[PDB]
Amino acid sequence: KEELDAFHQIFTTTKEAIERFMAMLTPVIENAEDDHERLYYHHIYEEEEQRLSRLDVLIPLIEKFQDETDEGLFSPSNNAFNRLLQELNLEKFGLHNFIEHVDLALFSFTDEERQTLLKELRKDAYEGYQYVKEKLAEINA
Amino acid sequence: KEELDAFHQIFTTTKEAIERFMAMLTPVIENAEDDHERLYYHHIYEEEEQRLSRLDVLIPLIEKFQDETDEGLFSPSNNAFNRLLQELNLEKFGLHNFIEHVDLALFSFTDEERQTLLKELRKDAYEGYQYVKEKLAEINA
Ligand SMILES: [Fe+3]
Ligand SMILES: [Fe+3]
Q1: d(CA B52, CA B92)
Q2: Do A100 and B46 count as a contact with CB atoms less than 8 A apart?
Q3: Nearest CA to CA, how far is B14 from chain A (Å)?
Q4: A54 and A87 Cβ atoms separated by less than 8 Å
Q5: B37-52: burial string, b at 16+ Cβ within 10 Å, e else
Q6: Are B60 and B12 in contact, with CB atoms under 8 Å apart?
Q7: Which of B55, B56, B61 is nearest to B4 (CA)?
Q8: Contact present, A66 and A53 (Cβ < 8 Å)
Q9: Alpha helices in chain B (DSSP H)
Q10: Rg of chain B's alpha carbons, rounded to an integer?
Q11: How far apart are CA A91 and CA B36, in angstroms?
């Protein structure tokens, strides 16, 4: 399945993107002016941390499926297929929420360096989201 | 299991709380001044909408377990037990994120009426979170 390879690449990319976005958020949280601003950026940080923990479950499960798509003879268990569809659907919403976190940060981090990095993260996530959305829809066969 | 009844009550309460918090957010989003503010409140709305969709899966699964805890003779399937622990753990983080959304709104909605409602939602979620956290920890038996 080329789809499983694409999913593997999309969610590996997004894991690295989370790490780069957390590194960006870290000084902002440590230097926050006042309780509201501190909670806001720490909250987004936590949501992405949670998403990273889930990706470390999803990516290995993609990998089990990939391991069998060269023999290409056995259909996945319907239990396994459903666990993978559930995890992919949840992480589709995670990608969308990440795009919006990046969009929110783009409003607040106006220097050229962070603008450039955030726009790059956003472009990758957008591409990955649109692929995941389309292929999950196509999976009502 | 008194625990399953408590979980049922905590997640039913939080579903109704999401609905009341979304009703609060709705006019704020429709009247938002400018793109940043609109995205911010619409983003929180979406995250709670996503959480509501998951609660409509979790609560029925609690209910299947409850249905058997009066005969109290059959242990759950280990597959069912694990699906319920996974969903409960995810919704523990959802409760925590909801507490933080309410905390963020408490900074911005300063009138007495919305302050009072938000503090009530926050208290219930806090109590429910602390119970879910403690009981999931205790579930390494
Ligand atoms: Fe968020
Ligand atoms: Fe949030």
Answers
A1: 13
A2: yes
A3: 19
A4: yes
A5: eebbbbbbbebbebbe
A6: no
A7: B61
A8: no
A9: 2-30, 35-68, 78-108, 112-138
A10: 17
A11: 24
Neighbouring C-alpha atoms within 13 Å toward the C-beta of B94: 23
Gap between the Cα atoms of A77 and A63, Å rounded:
15
Does A39 contact B79 at a Cβ distance shorter than 8 Å? no
Instruction: Report the amino acid identity of residue B89.
Output: N
Q: Would you list the domain boundaries of chain B?
A: 1-141
Nearest to A122 by CA among A107, A139, A137, A141: A107
Backbone CA torsion sign across A26, A132, B91, A97: positive
Separation between Cα atoms, residue B125 and residue B97, nearest integer Å: 10
B11 and B91 Cβ atoms separated by less than 8 Å = yes
Q: Which of B47, B93, B96 sits opposite A97 (nearest CB)?
A: B47
Structural tokens at position A25: 């958020």
* Contact call for residues A85 and A139 (beta carbons, < 8 A): yes
Spatial contact of A21 and A13, defined as CB atoms under 8 Å apart: no
Distance CA A97, CA A91 (A): 9
